[PDB]
């Protein structure tokens, strides 16, 4: 029901900044966002860009995000699992919180 966009999402370069837009989410709440690749059942996300944002009264938010073609990645609890290469691993930018998962948008470099 909420909307979640990430653009551009293809033809990407390491360190490129993309735009993130959320709408129709829970009003006035905190959500989390990160670039991750699925490995072994858990998501290995970039800990240097993993972050949070708040929504306005309409459940919307927008901000910029830096994507990495490859990076040293960690699981949700902070455990390092080594490095991920998005030229081969299926990386996506995903957002959400305990009450609602806003979705996944696949990234291509």
UniProtKB/Swiss-Prot annotation:
GO biological process assignments: defense response to bacterium
Disulfide bonds: 36-45, 86-91
Highest rank taxon of the organism: Bacteria
Keyword Kinase recorded: no
Protein keywords: Antibiotic, Antimicrobial, Disulfide bond, DNA-binding, Signal
GO molecular function: DNA binding
Reported function: Binds non-covalently to a chromophore which is the cytotoxic and mutagenic component of the antibiotic. The chromophore binds to DNA as a weak intercalator and causes single- and double-strand breaks.
Similarity field: Belongs to the neocarzinostatin family.
Name of the protein described by the UniProt record: Antitumor antibiotic C-1027 apoprotein
Organism field: Streptomyces globisporus
Lineage of the species this protein comes from: Bacteria, Bacillati, Actinomycetota, Actinomycetes, Kitasatosporales
Parent-record interval covered: 34 to 142 of 143
């Amino acid at each position: 029901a909420p909307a979640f966009s990430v653009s551009p999402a293809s033809g990407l370069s390491d360190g490129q900044s993309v735009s993130v837009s959320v709408s129709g989410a829970a009003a006035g709440e905190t959500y989390y966002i990160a670039q991750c690749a699925p490995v072994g059942g858990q998501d290995a996300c970039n800990p240097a860009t993993a972050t949070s944002f708040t929504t306005d009264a309409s459940g919307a938010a927008s901000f910029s995000f830096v994507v990495r073609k490859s990076y040293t990645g960690s699981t949700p609890e902070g455990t390092p699992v080594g490095s991920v290469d998005c030229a081969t691993a299926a990386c996506n930018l995903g957002a959400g919180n305990s009450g609602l998962d806003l979705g996944h948008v696949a990234l291509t470099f």
